[PDB]
């Protein structure tokens, strides 16, 4: 014979609990990647982005190593 249902209350805050939030952790990860890719794409034109980030990527990085010949540069 059972006298009482068997349960506990999990910690919660603002209607969130750890079981639920843990399911969404991967999703935040992917959104972070999306935001990262997007942000980087938006500043791909910025010379510093090319110099410090994009030109350092192996193989692909030579896409962003471009020199104007001294003969063609007024400045």
């Amino acid at each position: 014979y059972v006298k009482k249902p068997s349960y506990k209350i999990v910690p919660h805050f603002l209607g969130f609990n750890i079981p639920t939030v843990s399911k969404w952790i991967p999703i935040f990860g992917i959104w972070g990647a999306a935001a990262g890719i997007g942000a980087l794409f938006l500043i791909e034109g910025v010379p510093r982005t090319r110099q410090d980030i994009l030109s350092k990527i192996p193989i692909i990085g030579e896409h962003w190593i471009r020199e104007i010949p001294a003969s063609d540069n007024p400045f």
Binding site: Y7, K8, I9, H12
Partner: protein, 124 residues
């Protein structure tokens, strides 16, 4: 803060002999300088009402208490706009300053907080 919190903390203080000996006189002075009684309010008239919980508690007031509260609010509003204070029978006496709303809001909140807990139950 929830009314529940305020009531529970106050009860912890009122239990402790030392704590009550210090806090109760301070609280009474505070209430005297607060001066809400000089506009004919009861303390509970001042509680923020624009919340689902408080709107529910106000709907549960007995009609009599509800009608009297309306009058106190209108009367205080009239004192406020006239820059006058209550005189005579309009001043809330300490014995008239009853916690008419506290039991209703404590029941509303008890259910709301139980609901939040039970929404997070885990079968063992």
């Amino acid at each position: 803060a929830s009314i529940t919190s305020v009531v529970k903390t106050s009860e912890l203080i009122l239990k402790s002999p030392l704590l009550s000996k210090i806090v109760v006189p301070l609280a009474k002075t505070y209430v005297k300088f607060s001066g809400y009684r000089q506009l004919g309010f009861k303390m509970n008239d001042l509680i923020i009402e624009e919340t689902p919980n408080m709107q529910l508690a106000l709907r549960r007031l007995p009609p009599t208490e509800s009608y009297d509260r309306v009058y106190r609010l209108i009367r205080a509003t009239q004192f406020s706009l006239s820059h006058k204070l209550a005189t005579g029978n309009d001043i809330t006496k300490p014995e008239e300053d009853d916690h008419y709303l506290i039991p209703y809001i404590l029941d509303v909140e008890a259910e709301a907080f139980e609901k939040d807990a039970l929404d997070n139950l885990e079968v063992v």
